[PDB]
Amino acid sequence: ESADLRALAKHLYDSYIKSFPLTKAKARAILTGTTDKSPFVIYDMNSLMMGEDKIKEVAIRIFQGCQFRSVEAVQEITEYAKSIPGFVNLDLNDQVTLLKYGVHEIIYTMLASLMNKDGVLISEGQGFMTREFLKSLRKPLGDFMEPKFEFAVKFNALELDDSDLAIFIAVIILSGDRPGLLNVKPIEDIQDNLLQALELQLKLNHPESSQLFAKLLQKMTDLRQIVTEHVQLLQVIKKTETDMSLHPLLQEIYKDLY
Amino acid sequence: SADLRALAKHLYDSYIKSFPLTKAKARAILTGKTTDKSPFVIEVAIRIFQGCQFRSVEAVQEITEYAKSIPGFVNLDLNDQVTLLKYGVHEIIYTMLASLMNKDGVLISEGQGFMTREFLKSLRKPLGDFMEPKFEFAVKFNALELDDSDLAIFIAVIILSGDRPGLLNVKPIEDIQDNLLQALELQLKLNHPESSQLFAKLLQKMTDLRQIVTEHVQLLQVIKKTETDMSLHPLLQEIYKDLY
Ligand SMILES: O=C(O)[C@H](Cc1ccccc1)Oc1ccc(-c2ccccc2)cc1
Ligand SMILES: O=C(O)[C@H](Cc1ccccc1)Oc1ccc(-c2ccccc2)cc1
Numbered sequence: 166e167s168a169d170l171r172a173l174a175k176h177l178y179d180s181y182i183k184s185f186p187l188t189k190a191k192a193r194a195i196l197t198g199t200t201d202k203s204p205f206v207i208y209d210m211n212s213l214m215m216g217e218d219k220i221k222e223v224a225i226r227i228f229q230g231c232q233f234r235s236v237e238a239v240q241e242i243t244e245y246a247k248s249i250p251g252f253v254n255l256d257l258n259d260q261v262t263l264l265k266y267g268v269h270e271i272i273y274t275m276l277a278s279l280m281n282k283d284g285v286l287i288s289e290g291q292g293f294m295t296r297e298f299l300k301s302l303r304k305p306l307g308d309f310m311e312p313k314f315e316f317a318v319k320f321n322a323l324e325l326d327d328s329d330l331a332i333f334i335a336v337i338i339l340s341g342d343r344p345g346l347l348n349v350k351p352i353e354d355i356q357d358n359l360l361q362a363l364e365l366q367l368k369l370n371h372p373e374s375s376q377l378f379a380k381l382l383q384k385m386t387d388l389r390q391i392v393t394e395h396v397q398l399l400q401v402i403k404k405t406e407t408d409m410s411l412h413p414l415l416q417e418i419y420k421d422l423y
Numbered sequence: 424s425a426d427l428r429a430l431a432k433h434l435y436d437s438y439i440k441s442f443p444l445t446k447a448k449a450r451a452i453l454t455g456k457t458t459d460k461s462p463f464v465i466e467v468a469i470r471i472f473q474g475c476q477f478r479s480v481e482a483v484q485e486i487t488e489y490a491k492s493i494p495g496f497v498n499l500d501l502n503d504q505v506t507l508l509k510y511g512v513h514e515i516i517y518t519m520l521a522s523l524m525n526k527d528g529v530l531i532s533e534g535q536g537f538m539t540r541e542f543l544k545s546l547r548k549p550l551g552d553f554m555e556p557k558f559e560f561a562v563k564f565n566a567l568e569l570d571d572s573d574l575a576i577f578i579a580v581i582i583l584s585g586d587r588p589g590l591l592n593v594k595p596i597e598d599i600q601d602n603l604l605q606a607l608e609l610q611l612k613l614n615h616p617e618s619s620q621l622f623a624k625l626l627q628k629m630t631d632l633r634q635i636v637t638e639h640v641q642l643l644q645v646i647k648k649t650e651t652d653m654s655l656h657p658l659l660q661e662i663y664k665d666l667y
Contacts, residue, residue, distance in 0.1 A: 225484070229480065229484060232480050233477065233480055235659060236473065236476050236477055236480060236659060239658045239659045239662075240469070240473055240654070243653050243654055243656075243658060244654065246653065247653060247654065253653075257649075257650075257651055260653050261647070261653065261656060261658070261661060264653060264658055265658065265661055265662050265665060265666065266666075268658065268659075268662060269662070269666075392666075396666065396667050399667065403505070407501060409487050409490070409491060409497075409504055409505070409508060410484065410487055410488065410491070412505065414483050414487065414505070414508055414509065414512070415479060415480060415483045415512075415663075416663040416667050417505065417509055418483075418509050418512060418513070419659075419660040419663040419664050420663050420664050420667060421509060422509070422510070422513075422636070422640060423640050423643060423644075423660055423664060
């Protein structure tokens with residue numbers, strides 16, 4: 166096929182644009198000092214102090230920032246998922262299972278688009294927080310973002326664009342091996358087609374590269390472990406951080422009471 | 424008193440620092456006499472509920488800060504601090520939400536808007552049911568006419584509840600709560616002399632709070648198991664429950 170596979174890729178790209186406000190192209194334009202308002206750079210504490218002026222303690226603020234982001238991201242990703250042909254015809258429980266596992270893997274995928282070697286874009290491109298600043302933080306915070314940077318630098322060296330990413334994300338969501346799925350076949354049928362679309366897309370968009378498709382499938386597997394490592398940093402915090410302002414208490418509430 | 428009145432003052436001052444919209448502020452807006460920018464009067468199912476989810480994120484931080492200011496609290500075993508806050512948060516969210524409600528609707532976005540009760544009740548099948556029980560609670564709660572000074576102590580008593588499941592050291596929690604209860608009582612006697620039995624009514628309300636929370640959780644569980652549209656599931660809550 167081409168037509169259909171190409172048509173599918175375009176459909177995914179269009180819905181990705183509708184669902185996700187900050188695209189990689191947008192982020193890359195800003196990270197390329199394309200001067201249409203340079204981002205404010207947060208690079209030491211002196212410069213952190215000023216950052217509450219030209220944007221919308223520091224540990225708390227960074228952590229709450231992440232929690233807010235997850236709220237927004239779930240809605241964006243859910244909308245994207247619903248646009249994947251076949252998805253909303255799956256059993257309700259399986260739709261839940263797929264999104265439940267897919268969400269965080271996609272958050273870290275898309276976070277890479279805002280990162281480079283040196284730091285991460287924040288507040289919708291208004292600011293840039295330095296990697297080494299994040300590293301210098303206090304005990305819980307110092308090693309929180311670093312694994313996401315490690316992931317991102319290697320991920321970004323593959324040079325995917327938004328068109329690639331739209332199909333990548335769709336393949337991840339339609340993963341037939343999530344624990345607890347009830348009907349695997351229809352999920353796999355959809356994913357097989359998405360994988361063919363991805364492959365064709367990569368062949369057309371990436372002449373210079375070898376084995377990009379296979380590399381990308383490796384990355385889908387790596388994401389699983391990025392999720393599990395993040396969850397485990399949080400568990401250490403729950404058991405050892407003396408200051409309740411630094412615990413992810415909302416997460417504990419939903420787990421134990423809801 | 425010295426201590427009991429001093430404790431009441433300390434709690435009130437920290438409540439003011441920790442919680443931006445006070446009942447007095449809210450009551451002033453809900454007074455169309457006090458015109459200093461009238462509130463704007465109000466898919467939607469999704470938007471309103473994402474709005475609640477955002478609010479919970481913010482509220483946890485405010486309440487945590489308040490809790491830390493209660494003398495004794497930060498010296499408790501860490502597990503117990505977690506347990507107390509974990510159960511306290513939603514009960515306090517609904518307590519404080521009552522301050523923004525009257526029988527006709529609820530103040531939102533820091534007093535910038537007013538959503539009518541009728542509008543909230545009219546929504547689609549899952550959504551219609553969410554806010555109404557909170558309104559029922561609030562109307563009766565607000566007829567007790569507590570002010571912010573009262574509320575500061577009320578909330579502290581709730582947080583220091585010695586019967587939360589999973590507590591390891593009950594005694595030190597009860598010692599602090601016994602004092603908070605005495606402060607509350609004295610406060611109510613001094614601030615609401617005309618209101619015999621207010622203290623007892625307030626303790627009933629603490630228990631009712633636990634019911635409100637449980638009903639809200641249950642509405643959400645029905646949704647998780649029966650709503651065909653994923654946009655209407657509380658997917659974040661499902662993620663933290665199953666994976667985290
Ligand atoms: O687990 C999640 O949903 C997010 C995921 C995320 C991670 C990096 C950027 C954006 C989102 O990570 C969090 C990290 C820390 C916290 C948190 C919040 C308050 C206090 C302590 C930790 C919450 C979520
Ligand atoms: O349970 C919670 O943490 C909040 C509590 C709350 C209730 C009213 C005002 C502020 C907070 O209520 C929610 C209600 C619905 C939802 C939700 C979100 C997305 C899709 C479906 C339901 C999330 C939270």
